[PDB]
Design an enzyme around this catalytic site. Structure first.
Site, PDB file in Angstrom:
ATOM      1  CG  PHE A   1      63.796  47.749  18.746  1.00 35.33           C
ATOM      2  CD1 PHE A   1      64.579  48.749  18.199  1.00 35.33           C
ATOM      3  CD2 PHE A   1      64.070  47.294  19.965  1.00 35.33           C
ATOM      4  CE1 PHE A   1      65.699  49.332  18.934  1.00 35.33           C
ATOM      5  CE2 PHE A   1      65.102  47.866  20.685  1.00 35.33           C
ATOM      6  CZ  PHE A   1      65.876  48.868  20.184  1.00 35.33           C
TER       7      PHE A   1
ATOM      8  CG  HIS B   1      66.090  45.140  23.335  1.00 31.88           C
ATOM      9  ND1 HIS B   1      65.063  44.805  22.456  1.00 31.88           N
ATOM     10  CD2 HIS B   1      65.502  45.821  24.368  1.00 31.88           C
ATOM     11  CE1 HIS B   1      63.921  45.281  22.944  1.00 31.88           C
ATOM     12  NE2 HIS B   1      64.143  45.871  24.105  1.00 31.88           N
TER      13      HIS B   1
ATOM     14  CG  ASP C   1      63.910  46.671  28.428  1.00 26.50           C
ATOM     15  OD1 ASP C   1      64.043  46.558  27.187  1.00 26.50           O
ATOM     16  OD2 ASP C   1      62.842  46.665  28.994  1.00 26.50           O
TER      17      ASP C   1
ATOM     18  CG  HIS D   1      62.212  42.224  25.372  1.00 24.53           C
ATOM     19  ND1 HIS D   1      63.108  42.364  26.389  1.00 24.53           N
ATOM     20  CD2 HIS D   1      61.755  43.463  25.110  1.00 24.53           C
ATOM     21  CE1 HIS D   1      63.188  43.650  26.703  1.00 24.53           C
ATOM     22  NE2 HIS D   1      62.437  44.356  25.892  1.00 24.53           N
TER      23      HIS D   1
HETATM   24  C1  LIG Z   1      59.296  46.220  24.191  1.00 23.18           C
HETATM   25  S1  LIG Z   1      60.966  46.967  23.802  1.00 23.18           S
HETATM   26  C2  LIG Z   1      60.601  48.821  24.146  1.00 23.18           C
HETATM   27  O1  LIG Z   1      59.660  49.292  25.123  1.00 23.18           O
HETATM   28  C3  LIG Z   1      60.279  49.771  23.029  1.00 23.18           C
HETATM   29  O2  LIG Z   1      61.672  49.854  22.678  1.00 23.18           O
HETATM   30  C4  LIG Z   1      62.349  50.722  23.407  1.00 23.18           C
HETATM   31  O3  LIG Z   1      61.905  51.596  24.004  1.00 23.18           O
HETATM   32  C5  LIG Z   1      63.838  50.480  23.386  1.00 23.18           C
HETATM   33  C6  LIG Z   1      64.267  49.103  23.888  1.00 23.18           C
HETATM   34  S2  LIG Z   1      63.476  48.760  25.476  1.00 23.18           S
HETATM   35  O4  LIG Z   1      62.315  48.447  24.883  1.00 23.18           O
HETATM   36  N1  LIG Z   1      64.521  51.382  24.290  1.00 23.18           N
HETATM   37  C7  LIG Z   1      65.365  52.323  23.896  1.00 23.18           C
HETATM   38  O5  LIG Z   1      65.505  52.596  22.677  1.00 23.18           O
HETATM   39  C8  LIG Z   1      65.891  53.172  24.971  1.00 23.18           C
HETATM   40  C9  LIG Z   1      65.199  54.553  24.983  1.00 23.18           C
HETATM   41  C10 LIG Z   1      65.844  55.345  26.176  1.00 23.18           C
HETATM   42  C11 LIG Z   1      65.554  56.771  26.175  1.00 23.18           C
HETATM   43  N2  LIG Z   1      65.822  57.470  24.946  1.00 23.18           N
HETATM   44  C12 LIG Z   1      66.285  57.410  27.346  1.00 23.18           C
HETATM   45  O6  LIG Z   1      67.125  58.264  27.079  1.00 23.18           O
HETATM   46  O7  LIG Z   1      65.976  57.086  28.494  1.00 23.18           O
HETATM   47  C13 LIG Z   1      59.431  49.439  21.736  1.00 23.18           C
HETATM   48  O8  LIG Z   1      60.103  49.558  20.648  1.00 23.18           O
HETATM   49  O9  LIG Z   1      58.192  49.062  21.790  1.00 23.18           O
HETATM   50 FE   LIG Z   2      62.674  46.518  25.583  1.00 20.07          FE
END
Ligand SMILES: CS[C@H](O)[C@@H](OC(=O)[C@H](C[SH]=O)NC(=O)CCC[C@H](N)C(=O)O)C(=O)O
Ligand SMILES: [Fe+2]
Length: 329
Positions: free
Chosen positions: A209, A212, A214, A268
């Site tokens: 990923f 980004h 958060d 991150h």
């Molecule tokens: C270590 S980044 C994260 O925790 C995680 O990635 C996510 O969850 C990503 C970026 S923040 O991390 N977040 C999203 O895709 C948002 C999801 C939101 C959710 N679907 C909602 O509706 O509240 C991962 O891939 O390990």
């Molecule tokens: Fe994140």
């Protein structure tokens, strides 16, 4: 090699009690970490993360393809036009490795005023059949409230850190209306691991990923004990050590807005690792109409040239933008 980021371990247990001085000493540590790499591990948090991990594994390893379609968000299943946020996010073998299950506030029931109004970002959770996943819905809803409690404590620490009274954020973080979400993310082991599900950073690092900030006020994350996260600092991307006993905490871009970037939302990214692992974020979101007036703790009068932004506006636009930037998960 890549250098290890400074990610201190902070005993947050005083934030559950009534020893004010002790809470200020925690708040100082949160301010220092927020001003440095932007990450810390919350320790002595009181949550049974081993059990979280076990219950989550039992779910991820038993759910079937049939159930995934039946639970799928709209992006995977056109019949589910009300599921934008909550439900199953499918893998695509050969193409997309990650898969996940998202749920929202358990109080978003059919009779909830925001559900009746069809207000954006509010949905009724979807669950698998109880007989196929016994105890899972009850476990997961309880987890929501366990991690909500921890997050309320953390919000009292961030408030004190910024020179505010301890309910400055927490007064907008309420069981009846929070937009917070839990995501139960599965990152699989695959042999062979398809290249199409590996992204490449400009520095050559293989990623699951991309970079980004958060979309959150703060993010309260449990992960398995497999190193994978990196944080951009002035000295470049640095590796965040894993610790599957603690919660990894960071600010999201709402906090950055409210503090005029005094507490930045750290950039991150997630390295590609061929390992069966979990990533279980709680995104600490406020209510739809919550507005905190922006301020600047570096200015004598605390004033900021940012305009107030409602949390619902923030959230609806952020979640779309992150999908457009880094892809549908
Ligand atoms: C270590 S980044 C994260 O925790 C995680 O990635 C996510 O969850 C990503 C970026 S923040 O991390 N977040 C999203 O895709 C948002 C999801 C939101 C959710 N679907 C909602 O509706 O509240 C991962 O891939 O390990
Ligand atoms: Fe994140």
């Amino acid at each position: 090699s890549v250098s290890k980021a400074n990610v201190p371990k902070i005993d947050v247990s005083p934030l559950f009690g009534d020893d004010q001085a002790a809470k200020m000493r925690v708040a100082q540590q949160i301010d220092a970490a927020s001003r440095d790499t932007g990450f810390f591990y919350a320790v002595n948090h009181g949550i049974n993360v081993q059990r979280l991990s076990q219950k989550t594994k039992e779910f991820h390893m038993s759910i079937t393809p049939e159930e995934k379609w039946d639970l799928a968000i709209r992006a995977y299943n056109k019949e589910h036009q009300d599921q934008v946020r909550a439900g199953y996010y499918l893998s695509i073998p050969g193409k997309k490795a990650v898969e996940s299950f998202c749920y929202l506030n358990p109080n978003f029931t059919p009779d909830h005023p925001r559900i009746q109004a069809k207000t954006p970002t509010h949905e009724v959770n979807v669950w698998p059949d109880e007989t196929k996943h016994p105890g899972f819905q009850d476990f997961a809803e309880q987890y929501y409230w366990d991690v909500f409690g921890l997050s309320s404590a953390l919000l009292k620490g961030y408030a004190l850190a910024l020179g505010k009274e301890e309910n400055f954020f927490a007064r907008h973080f309420k069981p009846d209306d929070t937009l917070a979400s839990v995501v139960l993310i599965r990152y699989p082991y695959l042999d062979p691991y398809p290249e199409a599900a590996i992204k490449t950073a400009a520095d050559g690092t293989k990623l699951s990923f991309e970079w980004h900030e958060d979309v959150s006020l703060i993010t309260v994350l449990y992960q398995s004990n497999v190193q994978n996260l990196q944080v951009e600092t002035a000295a470049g991307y640095q590796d965040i050590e894993a610790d599957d006993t603690g919660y990894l905490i960071n600010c999201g871009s709402y906090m950055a807005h409210l503090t005029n970037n005094y507490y930045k939302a750290p950039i991150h990214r997630v390295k590609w690792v061929n390992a069966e692992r979990q990533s279980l974020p709680f995104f600490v979101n406020l209510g739809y109409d919550s507005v905190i007036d922006p301020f600047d703790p570096r200015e004598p009068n605390g004033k900021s040239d940012r305009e107030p932004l409602s949390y619902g506006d923030y959230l609806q636009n952020g979640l779309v933008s992150l999908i457009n930037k880094n892809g549908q998960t």
